[PDB]
Design a binder for this molecule. Structure first.
Ligand SMILES: Nc1nc2c(ncn2[C@H]2C[C@H](O)[C@@H](COP(=O)(O)OP(=O)(O)OP(=O)(O)O)O2)c(=O)[nH]1
Ligand SMILES: [Ca+2]
Ligand SMILES: [Ca+2]
Ligand SMILES: [Ca+2]
Length: 341
DNA sequence: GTTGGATGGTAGC
DNA sequence: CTAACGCTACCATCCAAC
């Protein structure tokens, strides 16, 4: 079983250079404006020229404009990007029919049946790299290893424009040496209790017991981490099916005025039912984000699929239900559908 | 003495 | 208006219905 993995490089940004090569070699920042006020909102992504200064995805657009006044600030075009993804995802079907679209820029492959050893695998990722580059002008990063995790890890090591094989032997090696907070599945919070026990190596896990660990990080995590440490771990490729569909909007000013929030909410519902396209959901959750940016929500689940009209009326209740229990002014509000038939 | 649902915690794009 | 998008997936916890 050989698992190759691909993660496109500074994606949305790289796409924009493709369209506007006069940007090439000059820091670019891809923005999710929010119409609150001029330059309100956050950064989706930015290229490596920009990242050198500290402008990562996440940071507020006003921080970036502080840091990089003379850069190119661009409004995110998810739809344009989704196209370059889609196409690039169809190429990858030429190489393997066992393909698991992870994100918009990431897909795993099972090439195990297409090649025989990591050397032939290497050669594939190399052609795969050239395939995409010739047809879409996008550099990517290929990460190869025996299973999904380490593949995603082997790429995260090669980024950008890299290609990296992690073979059985190098795998023994990382379990011992790889810094725990670099494992896919580990955020800062979990990466913070891990030092609290002593587990800094992906293998350290094995020097602690079984329980207290889980009593600190949870059941799935213990049975995730320990398996990798004991290298028994193996996660299979499957085609992923979208389980939820949302839309959420920031309001021009914070409110508790139901007649003020309503039109914003009805926006989300409309654009949701389009983003649905034929999927009939049985569950709705109205999610609002509050002033202190704590995100809070209320949902309902129907024994049957919901019509557009149903969710119009049901969402209102839910918003009321939210107004009943949190007395804080709402800042962003949207809706979320799940449990499709 | 589970199964699911309602809310939220964490982690990654 | 005065900083913090928008999106998805998965697990942990808690309380009722069975
Ligand atoms: N709105 C928004 N978009 C994001 C966020 N994180 C990532 N994206 C978008 C922009 C990225 O190009 C794309 C994939 O995320 P990545 O982790 O791959 O960042 P990126 O690929 O641009 O860096 P790069 O490929 O790794 O060297 O999705 C985020 O927090 N918010
Ligand atoms: Ca990625
Ligand atoms: Ca990427
Ligand atoms: Ca981490």
């Amino acid at each position: 079983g050989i698992v190759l993995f691909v993660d496109f490089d500074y994606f949305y940004a790289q796409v924009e250079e493709v369209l506007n090569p006069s940007l090439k070699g000059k820091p670019v920042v891809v923005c999710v404006f929010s119409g609150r006020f001029e330059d309100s909102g956050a950064v989706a992504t930015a290229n490596y020229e920009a990242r050198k200064f500290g402008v990562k995805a996440g940071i507020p657009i006003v921080e970036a404009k502080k840091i990089l006044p003379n850069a190119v600030y661009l409004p995110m075009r998810k739809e344009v990007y989704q196209q370059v993804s889609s196409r690039i995802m169809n190429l990858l079907r030429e190489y393997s029919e066992k393909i698991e679209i992870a994100s918009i820029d990431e897909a795993y492959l099972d090439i195990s049946d297409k090649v025989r050893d990591y050397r032939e695998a290497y050669n594939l990722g190399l052609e795969i790299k050239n395939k995409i580059l010739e047809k879409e002008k996008i550099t990517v990063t290929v990460g190869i290893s025996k299973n999904k995790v380490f593949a995603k890890i082997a790429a995260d090591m090669a980024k950008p424009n890299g290609i990296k094989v992690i073979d059985d032997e190098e795998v023994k090696r990382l379990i011992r040496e790889l810094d725990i907070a670099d494992v896919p599945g580990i955020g800062n919070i979990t990466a913070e209790k891990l030092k609290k026990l002593g587990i800094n190596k992906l293998v350290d896990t094995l020097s602690i017991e079984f329980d207290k660990l889980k009593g600190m990080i949870g059941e799935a995590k213990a049975k995730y981490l320990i398996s990798l440490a004991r290298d028994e771990y193996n996660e299979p490729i499957r085609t992923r099916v979208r389980k939820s569909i949302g839309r959420i909007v920031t309001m021009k000013r914070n409110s508790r005025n139901l007649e003020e929030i309503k039109p914003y909410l009805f926006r989300a519902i409309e654009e949701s039912y389009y983003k649905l396209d034929k999927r009939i959901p049985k569950a709705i959750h109205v999610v609002a984000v509050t002033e202190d940016l704590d995100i809070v929500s209320r949902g309902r689940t129907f024994p049957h699929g919901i019509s557009k009209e149903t969710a119009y009326s049901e969402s209102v209740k839910l918003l009321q239900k939210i107004l009943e229990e949190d007395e804080r002014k709402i800042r962003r509000i949207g809706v979320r559908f799940s449990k499709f038939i």
